[PDB]
């Protein structure tokens, strides 16, 4: 499953990033990000490409308020997928 928790302005994800868990976090994702300054997560096992769309869909509706979102604490698996599909550096931290 996929779980969501704010803990201030972090928006930590504790549930497993699967391909059938993007259905509950789709109608409430507009109110999910509220002034998040640093995305941090350490309780996932693997990352799928079908679940990789949420990390790219959280950038456009959060940058229009006038605040930047930093992305740290992730594994190197998302950076090997960054070069695999040539993800742009304007929406990626490139670490």
């Amino acid at each position: 499953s996929l779980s969501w928790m704010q803990t201030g302005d972090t928006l930590a994800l504790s549930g497993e990033l699967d391909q059938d868990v993007l259905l509950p976090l789709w109608e409430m994702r507009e109110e999910a990000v509220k002034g998040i300054t640093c995305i941090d997560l350490s309780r996932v096992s693997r990352v799928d490409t079908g679940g990789l769309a949420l990390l790219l869909h959280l950038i456009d509706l959060a940058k229009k308020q006038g605040n930047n979102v930093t992305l740290q604490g992730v594994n190197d698996k998302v950076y090997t997928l960054a070069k695999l599909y040539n993800l742009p550096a304007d929406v990626l931290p490139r670490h």
């Binding site: 259905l23 799928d48 490409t49 079908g50 769309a53 869909h57 599909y85």
Partner: protein
């Protein structure tokens, strides 16, 4: 840590046979190269792995129960982890190329319309077909059909990417393109890849386990570098292509004295 093991599967036809007591193992993280000339099975061995046809006696195990002797509903859930491609191009001509890559992950998993467009478009950059996502698939190039089938091959969870005879006849501007796609998918995901290309210089530079076999019997089960030097005139014919050797090269039916006198 093997994935699929074949234990002496024959698949005997109505008058002849294809395999005679073969032994095949696939390791986790390596590239399995199944090579051989015409006379043995190349594309009919992988159809026994998926379970589309019924084989002869013998056991083939995809790390668990038997594949071709299980139920129907269980077989559709284990075969989705392979998602192999085809040689001629497994692309539907009735729909667009945007729906050809999307056709697996539309009916398998549940994605809404803004979420589905963000998953099928990002898969086309690894094969180089993101700009070619709004044209008709009625016309392509010599190597563009294999890139579109590979972009939809990894839409599901990949475990056994069986490359159904890649780059068997192609131009050298894509020969260094598709063999790079073997190395990219095997290294980034850590999944296994099975290539059945019989061209000796290209597949042996990226594979770690070669399987040379002839006269419907397995004879070589070593690595890609330990099979070049061995004292037997059976596997040096396939590696170093010459005219004579184990082949008769005459096709004899007489003595060349009974004919052409009258």
């Amino acid at each position: 840590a093997n994935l699929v093991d074949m234990r002496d599967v024959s698949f005997t036809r109505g008058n002849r046979c294809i395999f005679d007591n073969i032994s095949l193992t696939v390791p986790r993280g390596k590239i399995t190269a199944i090579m051989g000339p015409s006379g043995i099975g190349k594309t009919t061995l992988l159809r026994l792995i998926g379970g589309q046809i019924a084989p002869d006696h013998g056991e083939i195990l995809f790390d668990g129960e038997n594949i071709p002797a299980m139920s129907r509903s269980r077989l559709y859930t284990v075969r989705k982890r392979m998602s192999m491609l085809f040689q001629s191009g497994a692309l539907f001509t009735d729909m667009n190329v945007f729906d050809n890559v999307a056709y697996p992950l539309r009916e398998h998993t549940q994605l809404p319309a803004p979420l589905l467009h963000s998953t099928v478009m990002m898969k086309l950059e690894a094969v180089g077909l993101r700009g070619a996502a709004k044209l008709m698939p009625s016309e392509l190039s010599g190597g563009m059909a294999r890139r579109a089938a590979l972009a939809r091959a990894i839409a599901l969870e990949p475990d056994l990417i069986m490359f159904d005879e890649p780059f068997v006849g192609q131009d050298p501007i894509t020969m260094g393109v598709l063999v790079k796609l073997i190395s990219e998918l095997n290294s980034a995901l850590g999944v296994t890849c099975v290539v059945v290309s019989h061209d000796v210089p290209e597949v042996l530079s990226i594979a770690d386990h070669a399987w040379i076999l002839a006269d419907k019997k397995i004879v070589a089960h070593g690595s890609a570098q330990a099979l070049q030097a061995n004292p037997d005139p059976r596997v040096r014919q396939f590696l170093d292509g010459i005219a004579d050797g184990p082949v008769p090269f005459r096709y004899p039916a007489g003595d060349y004295h009974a004919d052409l006198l009258p």
